[PDB]
Amino acid sequence: MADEKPKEGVKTENNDHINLKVAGQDGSVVQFKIKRHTPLSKLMKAYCERQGLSMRQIRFRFDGQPINETDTPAQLEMEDEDTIDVFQQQTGGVY
Numbered sequence: 001m002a003d004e005k006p007k008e009g010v011k012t013e014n015n016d017h018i019n020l021k022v023a024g025q026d027g028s029v030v031q032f033k034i035k036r037h038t039p040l041s042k043l044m045k046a047y048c049e050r051q052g053l054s055m056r057q058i059r060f061r062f063d064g065q066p067i068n069e070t071d072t073p074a075q076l077e078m079e080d081e082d083t084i085d086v087f088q089q090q091t092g093g094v095y
Contacts, residue, residue, distance in 0.1 A: 014035065018033070018035070019079060019082070020034060021081060023083045023084070023086065024088050024095075025086075025087065025095065026054075026057075026088035027051070028094075036073060036074045038072070040060070040071070040072075041069060044069075053089065053093040053094075054089040054093050057087070057089045058086060060084050061084065061085050062078060062084050063085065
């Protein structure tokens with residue numbers, strides 16, 4: 001069915017608080033914090049804002065199984081300072 005798709009920056013209640021590490025071999029490792037029920041997308045958009053060198057070349061992957069955009073750390077078990085391997089461009093960023 002058709003519905004709204006608000007993709008803006010906003011704050012919300014505090015559910016959980018886990019840890020994550022974006023180890024980009026094609027760029028650099030970066031640590032960040034997020035809640036249990038939170039759209040990883042919000043993290044992507046923010047990334048570009050800082051280092052918009054490869055927003056269309058981002059792919060979160062873990063040493064166990066692939067990850068999508070409609071997924072969460074709740075049913076992924078990716079907490080406790082879990083470093084999710086991520087790949088990026090080769091001639092666009094800086095590694």
